[PDB]
Design an enzyme around this catalytic site. Structure first.
Site, PDB file in Angstrom:
ATOM      1  CG  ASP A 147      -2.369   0.581   0.852  1.00 35.70           C
ATOM      2  OD1 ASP A 147      -3.164   0.005   1.078  1.00 35.70           O
ATOM      3  OD2 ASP A 147      -2.226   2.022   1.003  1.00 35.70           O
ATOM      4  CG  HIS A 185      -5.271   3.725   1.146  1.00 39.63           C
ATOM      5  ND1 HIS A 185      -4.868   2.601   0.927  1.00 39.63           N
ATOM      6  CD2 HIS A 185      -6.905   3.625   1.091  1.00 39.63           C
ATOM      7  CE1 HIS A 185      -5.853   1.943   0.477  1.00 39.63           C
ATOM      8  NE2 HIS A 185      -7.020   2.622   0.294  1.00 39.63           N
ATOM      9  CG  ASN A 195     -13.678   1.326  -3.847  1.00 38.67           C
ATOM     10  OD1 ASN A 195     -14.024   0.405  -3.223  1.00 38.67           O
ATOM     11  ND2 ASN A 195     -12.759   1.983  -3.377  1.00 38.67           N
ATOM     12  CB  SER A 221      -9.135   0.285   0.473  1.00 35.12           C
ATOM     13  OG  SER A 221      -8.919   0.448  -0.812  1.00 35.12           O
TER      14      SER A 221
END
Length: 279
Positions: free
Chosen positions: A39, A69, A161, A224
């Site tokens: 990530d 994130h 998404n 996520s």
């Protein structure tokens, strides 16, 4: 063990019903397992990680999470308050820049890195990788995810998404990894969650409280956020000896809460990750 006033998603993964707020889990808590969070990095100094997180690789000038994130996702895997597997070891691989973007070649390199790097780590109960990222279909990205899984790592990836079929995104569309859609606290499919035959499981993904950079916390939403619930669940179940890296996705689907979610399109599994813990 019981954690009262837990984030709703933790309570949800240890419950047969929505609408409760205590997380129940075996106290082994993923000890002896390892989870790689591939990530934007991890703020490993965050008190919530208790010395159990470390950066092991970056492809950028720094290993710091300048975004948040990756720290949020790592917190859902394994932070003390916000994590599923509160005693796992967390390893950060920074394939995304501080804007949250990364070239597919860097993401591929990061996956192959984990497949090798686990041989430099102590993970007697097994190894998981959490990939809360993706883009358009790429056979090379899918193959890298497949190699990582084949090497003996439980790979959990976000469905995406786009409120669309995940077959058109990578690594979501790789059949051999565990593709994770998102749900909300009322057991609805999250409005943005991708769907389709390639999904293996849903996890909590709307309004998920976790760690953030600067030693902080916040609630955000996405596939996520669902992915690290499943990655942490796998680590927890591996520590318990209930499954293995090669079999954990199937085991999670086998033992999931079935038929509880609304607005699941015909042809998508109606399966919600569940630890089946009996206190």
């Amino acid at each position: 063990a019981a954690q009262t006033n837990a984030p709703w998603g933790l309570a949800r993964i240890s419950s047969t019903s929505p609408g409760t707020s205590t997380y129940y889990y075996d106290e082994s808590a993923g000890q002896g397992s390892c989870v790689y969070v591939i990530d934007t990095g991890i703020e490993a100094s965050h008190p919530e990680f208790e010395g159990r997180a470390q950066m092991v690789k970056t492809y950028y000038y720094s290993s710091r999470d300048g975004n948040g994130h990756g720290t949020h996702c790592a917190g859902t895997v394994g932070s003390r308050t916000y994590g599923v597997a509160k005693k796992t070891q967390l390893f950060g691989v920074k394939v995304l820049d501080d804007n949250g973007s990364g070239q597919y070649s860097t993401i591929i390199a990061g996956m192959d890195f984990v497949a090798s790097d686990k041989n430099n780590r102590n993970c007697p109960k097994g190894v998981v990788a959490s990939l809360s990222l993706g883009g358009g279909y790429s056979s090379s990205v899918n193959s890298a995810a497949a190699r990582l899984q084949s090497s003996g790592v439980m790979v959990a990836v976000a469905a995406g998404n786009n409120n669309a079929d995940a077959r058109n995104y990578s690594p979501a569309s790789e059949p051999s990894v565990c593709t994770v859609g998102a749900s909300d606290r009322y057991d609805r499919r999250s409005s943005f969650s991708n769907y389709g035959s390639v999904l293996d499981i849903f996890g909590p993904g709307t309004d998920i409280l976790s760690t953030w950079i600067g030693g902080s916390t916040r609630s955000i939403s996405g596939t996520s956020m669902a992915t690290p619930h499943v990655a942490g669940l796998a680590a927890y179940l591996m520590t318990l000896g209930k499954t293995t890296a090669a079999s954990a996705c199937r085991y999670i689907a086998d033992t999931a809460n079935k038929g509880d979610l609304s607005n699941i399109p015909f042809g998508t599994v109606n399966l919600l990750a569940y630890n089946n813990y009996q206190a």
